Each structure stands twice: as C-alpha cells, then as structure tokens.
Homo-oligomer: A and B are copies of this chain.
C-alpha cells in the first residue's frame, strides 16, 4: 500500500537527515590563545582612611598569564596591601571581631572570615573601638569593596586570539580552527565574521547580555563555546566551528558563597633582615574555552543495523493495516 512506501520513506528520511548512516567520533582539542591590548590606569584608592594615587600602565605581563587547562584569566581590578610581616595585631573590625573585654576573645580561636589565630586578648584598633588580637601577617587587609571604578576597566577593549586544533583519531582527520589563507585582520561578529577568531571581550559580554564593567569590579567566570558539526563524507562535506557565548559564574551575590572571581597572591621580600610579604587581592574575569564536536563518516555496518531495525517495522506496518 501507500502507507508502506511512506514508512520506508520516513525511515530513510530519518536516516539521511538525522545522519544515521554516519559513524560519529568524539572531538579532541588543544587550545592556544594570545591576548593583546594594554590599559592605562589613573585612580584614587583609599588605604586606611588615606587617599593614595594608583597610576601607571598595564601591559600583557602585568595583567595576564598564558592559559593552562583550556582557560586564561585577565585581571580587571585589584586591592593591594603592602608591608605585612609575621606578628601580633588586632583583627580588622567586623561584626564578628569586635570585643568589649578580654572575656569576649578566646585564645587559639579560628574564624572563617578571619585570617589569623586569636590570642584571647581584647585590644584597641582605632580610637576606642576594640577588636580581638590575633597572630598572623600584620597589618590585616581591609574589608573593603573593590574600587567603584574597576581599575582595569579598559578590559572590554582587549583582544583575544584563539587557536584551536581538532583531531579525530578513528577517521585520522586533523584540522584547525583557522583555515589557511584567511584575512586575519577582523573582529569577530555573530554575522559579519562568524569564523573570525579575533574576539573583543566587551562584544563577548554583550552577547551574553551582561555588562562588562559590573563583572570587572568583583570578577566573574565567562565561557567561550566552540561547536564542530563535522561531516567526513564528501557527498555533503562540512567542518567548521560555531562560536557561542555563555556566562558561567553563578552571580549569587551572597557573602557566604564567595561571589565573583578573586584570589590572594603573595609576594615575599626581606627588609632589615625581617621576613616580609606584600599581599594582593586579585579580581578579574576567567575565560574557559569549551570545545566540543562530532565527526560523522559513512559506515556500512551502521547502515546494516539501521535497515535492521527498519525492515521489521516495514512489515509490521503491513500487519497493522
């Protein structure tokens, strides 16, 4: 009957369109990115109630490190606390660190917010305000918001160049993201330059619809996705990437969940024969490059299995009517 040529046709259609005849191999990627662009910074930051002038120019080595583990990071803001040395000092005044008397402090106590071990003594921090005394690197860094203008706010104007090599082992097929002979001088655009590997970070943040400056103040984790729908047949060959952009960070905005991206970097030195340390809280956006792909190539055994599940249907449609 007609419903049978229609069943055959629906099966074969699902084969040809859903690519059931092809064998699919997982993709293998290695990433090499180079960042370009510099930022000039003139800003006034308050340290310990005293105005200080942070000025200067930041180049590649000043704000970034080469990617490792398919992810690179760019510092967009920072807080610097200098001159720390091992000693005893009162903790920074917080809801949990203020003491009325020595009875309020407990010797040897450790608190998740604090950075030192208490000595069980109540001492003044400033004027008549009293905090608990601790043993740590002194003085203790301020509990302060990241500067209201992100010191490296120019970070949206930076340029990231992404090189991606992909290899399918089952089919012995190697290709790279940048095809030979292309005009390298371009800026990636969703339509105008969908294969251009030159990305602007601000463009990236507009794609996902999040403001760059806001994330740049306190940090975040952004992700770049590279898709490969690759066909290794010849009768319909195609194998290029599709760039998409997703914001990965949670954006909880709760003190308990350590929001944004930041980490503590330590630089050690010696003055007057004393072990000393400058502590730098680093704020920035970490970019994670995720590359995924599927390689299809005509396989005879798969066609055999597919018509295998197809023929039983083909006659069952006869038993049905």
Q: Which of A57-65, A123-131, A143-151 contacts B (4 or more CB under 8 A)?
A: A57-65
Interface size on A, residues (CB 8 A): 83
Given A18-B301, A68-B71, A288-B30 contact (CB < 8 Å): yes
> Could you tell me the distance in whole angstroms from the C-beta of A272 to the nearest C-beta in chain B?
14
In the complex, A250 Cα to B292 Cα: how many Å? 20
Interface residues of A in 182-202 (CB under 8 A from B): 184-185
In the complex, A174 Cα to B266 Cα: how many Å? 36
In the bound complex, do residue B36 and residue A112 qualify as a contact, i.e. CB atoms below 8 Å apart? yes
In the bound complex, do residue A250 and residue B59 qualify as a contact, i.e. CB atoms below 8 Å apart? no
In the bound complex, do residue A264 and residue B59 qualify as a contact, i.e. CB atoms below 8 Å apart? yes
A79 at the B interface (CB under 8 A): no
A316 at the B interface (CB under 8 A): yes
**Contacts of A40 on B, CB cut-off 8 Å?**
117, 135
A6 at the B interface (CB under 8 A): no
Q: What are the 5 closest A-B residue pairs judged by CB atoms, nearest first?
A: A69-B69, A308-B309, A61-B266, A61-B264, A66-B263
Q: Which of A92-100, A161-169, A209-217, A230-238 contacts B (4 or more CB under 8 A)?
A: A161-169
> Which one of B30, B56, B135, B279 contacts A248 once the chains associate, using CB atoms below 8 Å?
B30
Residue-wise, chain A 287-305 has the 8 Å CB interface mask toward B (1 for contact) of 0101010000000010011
In the complex, A14 Cα to B301 Cα: how many Å? 8
**Contacts of A312 on B, CB cut-off 8 Å?**
308-312
In the bound complex, do residue A135 and residue B71 qualify as a contact, i.e. CB atoms below 8 Å apart? no
In the bound complex, do residue B18 and residue A249 qualify as a contact, i.e. CB atoms below 8 Å apart? no
A241 at the B interface (CB under 8 A): no
> Which one of B18, B71, B115, B263 contacts A59 once the chains associate, using CB atoms below 8 Å?
B115
Nearest neighbor of A227 in chain B, beta-carbon distance? B169
Query: How many copies, total?
Result: 3
In the bound complex, do residue B263 and residue A65 qualify as a contact, i.e. CB atoms below 8 Å apart? yes
Interface residues of A in 17-51 (CB under 8 A from B): 18, 26, 28, 30, 32, 34, 36-38, 40
> Could you tell me the distance in whole angstroms from the C-beta of A256 to the nearest C-beta in chain B?
4
Given A250-B165, A250-B178, A290-B30, A116-B309 contact (CB < 8 Å): no
A265 at the B interface (CB under 8 A): yes
Max chain B C-beta neighbours (<10 A), residue from A61, A256, A305:
A61
**Contacts of A112 on B, CB cut-off 8 Å?**
36-37, 159
In the complex, A227 Cα to B159 Cα: how many Å? 36
Residue-wise, chain A 73-97 has the 8 Å CB interface mask toward B (1 for contact) of 0000000000000100000000000
**Contacts of A165 on B, CB cut-off 8 Å?**
248, 250
Residue-wise, chain A 256-267 has the 8 Å CB interface mask toward B (1 for contact) of 111001011111
**Contacts of A18 on B, CB cut-off 8 Å?**
301
> Could you tell me the distance in whole angstroms from the C-beta of A317 to the nearest C-beta in chain B?
10
Given A69-B70, A248-B30, A266-B62, A137-B309 contact (CB < 8 Å): no
Given A57-B117, A71-B69, A136-B57, A161-B258 contact (CB < 8 Å): yes
In the bound complex, do residue B308 and residue A313 qualify as a contact, i.e. CB atoms below 8 Å apart? yes
A221 at the B interface (CB under 8 A): yes
